Amino acid sequence: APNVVVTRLTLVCESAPGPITMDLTGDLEALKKETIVLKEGSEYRVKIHFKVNRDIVSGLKYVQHTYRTGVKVDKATFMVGSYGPRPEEYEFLTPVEEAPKGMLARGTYHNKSFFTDDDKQDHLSWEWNLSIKKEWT
Numbered sequence: 001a002p003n004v005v006v007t008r009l010t011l012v013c014e015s016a017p018g019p020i021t022m023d024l025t026g027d028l029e030a031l032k033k034e035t036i037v038l039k040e041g042s043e044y045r046v047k048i049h050f051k052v053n054r055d056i057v058s059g060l061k062y063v064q065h066t067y068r069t070g071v072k073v074d075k076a077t078f079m080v081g082s083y084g085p086r087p088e089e090y091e092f093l094t095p096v097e098e099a100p101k102g103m104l105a106r107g108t109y110h111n112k113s114f115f116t117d118d119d120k121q122d123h124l125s126w127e128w129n130l131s132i133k134k135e136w137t
């Protein structure tokens with residue numbers, strides 16, 4: 001078992017009718033078929049769940065690349081920092097942001113996320129799809 005294990009991604013959104021989350025311990029190829037849905041203009045935070053099993057780590061970073069077909073990538077990096085080993089998973093949350101809005105904001109976006117560090121370790125790399133819709137349903 002590696003020292004850092006990424007376990008889950010959650011979109012924290014007070015107005016969502018239900019939990020928006022994905023298990024990151026499973027088959028990564030199957031995560032693409034699981035699309036998660038955000039109402040346009042919704043306020044959200046990205047929450048990354050992870051475990052540190054053996055040794056203090058430093059310089060943890062969450063990197064999130066968002067692709068719409070035919071458009072330059074929308075890139076964001078977030079410093080996560082230093083964490084020591086413990087049985088319970090940790091939770092890191094990005095600052096609050098707003099999903100885009102308007103009919104032209106709707107559609108599917110293809111994300112690729114990286115949980116890494118200062119030593120450029122590939123703790124996890126994974127793809128997931130986001131659908132922006134006019135309504136939650």
Ligand SMILES: O=C(CNC(=O)[C@@H]1CCNC1)N[C@H](c1ccc(-c2ccccc2F)cc1)c1cccs1
Pocket residue numbers: 038044066067068071072073074097098099100101109111130
């Ligand atoms: O729209 C913008 C730029 N403008 C703003 O982000 C404004 C900032 C304040 N309101 C909106 N990027 C779009 C974008 C859409 C979805 C996400 C996304 C990713 C993960 C989780 C939830 C999300 F929503 C991120 C960015 C595009 C990406 C690629 C081509 S276009």
